[PDB]
Amino acid sequence: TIACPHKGCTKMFRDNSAMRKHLHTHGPRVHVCAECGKAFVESSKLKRHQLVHTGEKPFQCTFEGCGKRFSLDFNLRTHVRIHTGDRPYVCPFDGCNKKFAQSTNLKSHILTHA
DNA sequence: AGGGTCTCCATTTTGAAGCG
DNA sequence: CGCTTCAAAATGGAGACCCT
Ligand SMILES: [Zn+2]
Ligand SMILES: [Zn+2]
Ligand SMILES: [Zn+2]
Ligand SMILES: [Zn+2]
16 A cells, blocks of 8 residues: 655555545645636636636526526535435434434534533 | 546535524 | 524545546
């Protein structure tokens, strides 16, 4: 197993090919948004970051009455679930039955338990 | 192959309602 | 005004996907 070179990086890899790709993430952040300065290692991310600027919401809710738009594919899926009702984050407390559909929504709930 | 891309997830970060 | 709540915006890493 190849351990990631990168000074403080704890990570380990099967093939040094996976290690090298990975290593890429600590690299110089060459891709700098001309609008505000944020920089990204890849260009894909800088492109995507642009949606912070335009406001473009490409993905839309084909639910009757909804039609809400989101800028990101994944973010849309996470909301349509408020239609499906899929609350996939079941609380852990023995005998507390609250479910959630966001691991932020659920774990801070846990905080309440304490 | 193997390098840029992109799809996709998990996560983090931000905001708006509810409500006490 | 305090939260907890629920909902959205955004980021970062893995690794699949697509070349030539
Ligand atoms: Zn590393
Ligand atoms: Zn920017
Ligand atoms: Zn919807
Ligand atoms: Zn609980």
